[PDB]
Amino acid sequence: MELTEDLNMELRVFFDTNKSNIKDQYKPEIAKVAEKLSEYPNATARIEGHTDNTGPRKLNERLSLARANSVKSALVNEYNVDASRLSTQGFAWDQPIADNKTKEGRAMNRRVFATITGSR
Amino acid sequence: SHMELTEDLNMELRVFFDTNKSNIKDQYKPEIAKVAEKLSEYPNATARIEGHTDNTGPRKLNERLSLARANSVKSALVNEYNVDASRLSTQGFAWDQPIADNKTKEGRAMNRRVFATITGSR
Numbered sequence: 517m518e519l520t521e522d523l524n525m526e527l528r529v530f531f532d533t534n535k536s537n538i539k540d541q542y543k544p545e546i547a548k549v550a551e552k553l554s555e556y557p558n559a560t561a562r563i564e565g566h567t568d569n570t571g572p573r574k575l576n577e578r579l580s581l582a583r584a585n586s587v588k589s590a591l592v593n594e595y596n597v598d599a600s601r602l603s604t605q606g607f608a609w610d611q612p613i614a615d616n617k618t619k620e621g622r623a624m625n626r627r628v629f630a631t632i633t634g635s636r
Numbered sequence: 637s638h639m640e641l642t643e644d645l646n647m648e649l650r651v652f653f654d655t656n657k658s659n660i661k662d663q664y665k666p667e668i669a670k671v672a673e674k675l676s677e678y679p680n681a682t683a684r685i686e687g688h689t690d691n692t693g694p695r696k697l698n699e700r701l702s703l704a705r706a707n708s709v710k711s712a713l714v715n716e717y718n719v720d721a722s723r724l725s726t727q728g729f730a731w732d733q734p735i736a737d738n739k740t741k742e743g744r745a746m747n748r749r750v751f752a753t754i755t756g757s758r
């Protein structure tokens with residue numbers, strides 16, 4: 517008898533204009549991610565940050581990455597997760613998921629999407 | 637909800653039988669127990685149980701025996717571990733799907749089997 521369990525998770529964190537801090541409402545989901553990273557010790561996370569299309573290019577490139585790093589930082593510093601298991605990358609505004617022509621649209625683009633994959 | 641979480645279970649069970657028998661030999665109890673445990677941990681998982689025979693004896697005896705073997709594995713899960721019967725399918729294939737040489741005792745022993753695949757997510 518042989519068996520495997522595969523873990524697949526997606527975490528979505530949203531940010532306010534110019535901010536890269538993790539809102540308190542997202543703490544429970546980050547805690548769950550940490551829990552599963554312990555349950556599946558070989559799991560890794562691909563954290564990708566984004567920004568809306570407003571402002572200078574240099575600002576958003578740094579801001580998108582800062583947002584991804586904030587998520588990684590929470591896992592590393594608050595949950596004892598090894599940093600090497602978490603990759604971070606910023607895409608500025610090059611990958612929107614909503615329309616930047618609207619208030620709510622831009623709100624959706626200011627985000628960090630993290631994909632966690634593992635097996636045991 | 638700002639998060640999606642999925643765990644996929646894949647499990648393969650193998651049970652072998654003595655000639656003309658469909659009972660579960662005690663040596664397979666641990667495996668069956670492990671399957672039962674995962675079926676509880678993954679309440680929506682289902683199992684595909686398939687029974688077989690070696691090629692000796694009348695065709696109808698083997699059609700019935702192959703199915704009886706599959707049903708014996710299902711019965712263990714259902715009655716000893718209270719698994720919902722509807723989550724488990726059973727089917728017999730007589731001697732139609734050999735995995736070994738019917739010309740040897742060892743090969744025929746390998747053909748008298750039940751293979752079950754358990755899949756599902758939580």
Ligand SMILES: N[C@H](CCC[C@H](N)C(=O)O)C(=O)O
Pocket residue numbers: 532533534535566567568569570571576579626
């Ligand atoms: N419009 C903002 C700068 C751009 C922030 C935006 N690109 C983001 O992703 O937060 C400001 O008026 O200072």
Ligand SMILES: N[C@H](CCC[C@H](N)C(=O)O)C(=O)O
Pocket residue numbers: 654655656657688689690691692693694698701748
């Ligand atoms: N010795 C008996 C029963 C054979 C059952 C066998 N085909 C199996 O899969 O257990 C016969 O040859 O008629």
